[PDB]
Design a binder for this molecule. Sequence first.
Ligand SMILES: [Mg+2]
Ligand SMILES: [Mg+2]
Ligand SMILES: [Zn+2]
Ligand SMILES: [Zn+2]
Lengths: 589, 589
Amino acid sequence: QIDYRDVFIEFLTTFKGNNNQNKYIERINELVAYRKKSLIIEFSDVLSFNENLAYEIINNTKIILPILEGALYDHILQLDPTYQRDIEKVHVRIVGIPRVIELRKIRSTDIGKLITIDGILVKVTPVKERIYKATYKHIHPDCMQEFEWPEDEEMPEVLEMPTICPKCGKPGQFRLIPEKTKLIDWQKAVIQERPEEVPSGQLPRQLEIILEDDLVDSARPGDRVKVTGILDIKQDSPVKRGSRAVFDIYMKVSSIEVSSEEDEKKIKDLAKDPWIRDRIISSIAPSIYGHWELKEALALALFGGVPKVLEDTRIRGDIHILIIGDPGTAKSQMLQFISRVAPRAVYTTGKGSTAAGLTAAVVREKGTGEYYLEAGALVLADGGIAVIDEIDKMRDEDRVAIHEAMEQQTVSIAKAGIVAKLNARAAVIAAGNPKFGRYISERPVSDNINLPPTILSRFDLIFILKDQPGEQDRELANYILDVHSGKSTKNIIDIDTLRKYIAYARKYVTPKITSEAKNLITDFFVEMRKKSSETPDSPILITPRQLEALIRISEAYAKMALKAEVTREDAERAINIMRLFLESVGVDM
Amino acid sequence: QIDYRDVFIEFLTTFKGNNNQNKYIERINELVAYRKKSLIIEFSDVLSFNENLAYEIINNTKIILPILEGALYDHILQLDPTYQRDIEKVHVRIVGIPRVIELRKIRSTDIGKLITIDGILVKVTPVKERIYKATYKHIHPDCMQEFEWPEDEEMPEVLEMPTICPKCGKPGQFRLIPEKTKLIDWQKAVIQERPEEVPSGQLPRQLEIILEDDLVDSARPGDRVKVTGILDIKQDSPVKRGSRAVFDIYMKVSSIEVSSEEDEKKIKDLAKDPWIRDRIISSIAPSIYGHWELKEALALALFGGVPKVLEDTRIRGDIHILIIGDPGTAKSQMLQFISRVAPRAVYTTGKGSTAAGLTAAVVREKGTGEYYLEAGALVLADGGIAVIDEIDKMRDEDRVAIHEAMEQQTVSIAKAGIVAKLNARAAVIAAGNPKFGRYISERPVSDNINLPPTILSRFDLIFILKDQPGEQDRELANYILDVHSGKSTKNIIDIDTLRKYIAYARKYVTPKITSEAKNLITDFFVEMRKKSSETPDSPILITPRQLEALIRISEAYAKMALKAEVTREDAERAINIMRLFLESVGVDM
DNA sequence: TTTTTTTTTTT
Ligand SMILES: [Mg+2]
Ligand SMILES: [Mg+2]
Ligand SMILES: [Zn+2]
Ligand SMILES: [Zn+2]
């Protein structure tokens, strides 16, 4: 019963963070500048400042938020009167709730309480409008009266029409007036539990969440998010009894977090090391012995090149890697590691995927009867990495559907009266086996690969892996047994901070090509083309695409060290890595 | 007539266990400490204590269970007052009901009586909420009153709305109030009769069961369960009568069990025998003469290895066995025995299965038109054993769908806008015939097996069975006729005990590799690679997977004797069994 | 009819 608005104001105005700069007065300072009508407050901060205040938000969230939000609005008005007539209400979002519940463990006792759920966003609906205060006209020749139907109460989830006119007391028919109705933004989304918490032999479960007002379009499908809000039962057709007094539960989101300053200096400290590139390479798949050249190639694909957008066309900035090897060469283990360290990645297999599922699917809604597009794997991976294991097992008629997405980075659909074009700017990493399971050194490269030259030319680097039992078996066996014994390699960058390093580099680094790097790349390309003409029967063709691979690889090397330009050292590395690629496919220089 | 609450309370406090330890008193505090809010009792113990109490439960179940619930709740509160305000209702479940009825023999006379049914779970729905006490607000300009609609009575299965407002006596509009409504967890499951109970030439029958409150998520599909509760008729769509006074039936589950301390003593006593490993092997398929190396191999697959989960990757712990042999070599008979003895096994046929059915299928839901996922055979066998008979009869383009699930133990689907990953951690045992039906000694091994090297490397052990007539025919003929004569081999562990032994071993034993075992395994693997390179023509490749096979087999041998360490003795056995596998495929050592 | 994944018969 004690007043908390005064406690809120002093907490907001007076608070000391770890940085010791009064974090919480800068957020409200930016609140009036950009007019976002939403404030983020950490539960750890309010708990430290006032234990009693933190509890009251947890257990009395229903009747403490409108009071608390009203106090904040008055303080905002005092700071700047211009906020009036621009924003009517300001929302306060609380994050970091200790009450975290697994999606499968939700029971009846959790209804009506503020909880937090971690999951994967799979579906988003277009933004719509919801009525919370309607206006009606009594169509009865004596009334012609206007009244807001739900008095001193917002309109419930199910729309209800008045039966007795409050202005005359007589029944009849009522007409809604849209221009006098108050609306609010409304969006529906579906949250799926993470594969980590799925029990054995069970399919994952899904939960429906509702986003309103400024929370709409705050995330995209495939993201990993944490949602805080209140659970409630869902009503769809209350008019039809139809027995079965059983309801499903939904969630009203109060705040959403999508998966800080101390990370910047931590990343900058790593880049200061002159051997940062070697540290990153050594940190790729620490459980795999050897394969140093493959680890270097996979590191480049994670960073990628610099895309170019021009007046008339655009140039692909992503790097594609293809690996062919004998079974048991740990090709899949490295691909699994890539899908974990990448900030955004989609893992698919050759046999378990279709052309429609990879790019886009045209699906007909049974109710409406209209066709609409469904995002494929490549579309969902835009701006990230796409992994296609067992690519050689895909049907050739089905594999050609990704030819344009791999180079033009677009998906074109002309089906069922729908013509559309979707961006698919995603790097592709693929693995497969030779034609006869294992590579045969007694036969040419032409029949060993068994892939059309069109798709091969789209890959920047192609590595052929040969399992040759030699003198390294003892070293390999010792390394494997140490892994099984729990021994772990040291002096490596862990997966969590490595993911942050890649995300920062891909966002704030854009290397430029210098004059000295141009000469080295130009000379190598001329020699590469001349050497290729010696053998025309090989299925590997040196096209102008290979020249752009040199540029992309060179930029990726500079981006690893957070450099602002491509020097001659990066060009030398780019030439060296492709020399190994050419040697593997049988081209010697 | 008389009150049994005093008898019930003293029954728990005065009952004596097997060794006079009062096996009910220590359950009460466990319920209090863990707040499990559910207590189970045994009918035979109740019958052994007081015959009158047992009859009243078995007959007047609908009027004595709430009475015993109240007495139990009072006894908990006095034992620990803190139990209040956390659990407002405690359920008591009775098991071991003598009234057992087959699913196909249910008649109208059994309706409303406490009965027990044994069957197989097939379908489970997501957990929902059911209203048992609602709150309404009369939307009439004069009432604005809130009341609980069902007075002194639970809300029936049909959602019924008040017609006359009790607070004012007038009809009108009533609005449900979810905040004041009381809910209860609700789940729906389908149970199927056992295959051995189905009459000749008919499909198995199914029954619908309802699980509520703590009984939700009590089992997974494919389990064998025993459900006890009251039968009742199902009212689904009573809005329109449409004649047809015929109704279905459903069961309200009161207690459920799936598929003990006495068994642990028996299991531990068996492991004390030094020759337990040989005793266990002799118990595998007692009706099959010979094939000692195959029985030993099948025993290892039942126990398996130790899966390793690291911060960046995970290692398969299951063991895969492949058998190729001439027809009539009892391959199918031995595989059928494995399905019976394994705690969780799925039997499939190569011809009677498809790629979608083995791993996962995307099906368009008819009600909404939206695609969703259906678990395949491998997913349903997670944590168990998958048996694939006639693997050679599968289409090659269709058999490759299980390559990922057999090594990475995952299933990836990218179809119709659905991207998902599922765990398929199961062991695969497969059997098949050579290319020409029977093994041809003239031709090499490569054309006899007729399988790609990729799938062959996935199998830890491969055995080739040759039906060669010889001097052993008389011994085989005598053994078969003795089986047909009813004679049974003695000194073998029964199938029921063996299943319990395997389940205990797989849950509480995690062997570790010692230094001595590491040296023996490393030396053998190096020798294997050197020998394989000398003859680069065999269809078997010694990949690094073979090294991990030795580790998994070594752990399985230690796990068979409930040993916590892998001594040198287990390494020698693992090396010895692998030697026989190599000699079978013609790889001399 | 139409696109899609699936089991099935039959164009
Ligand atoms: Mg692989
Ligand atoms: Mg057979
Ligand atoms: Zn009126
Ligand atoms: Zn009333």
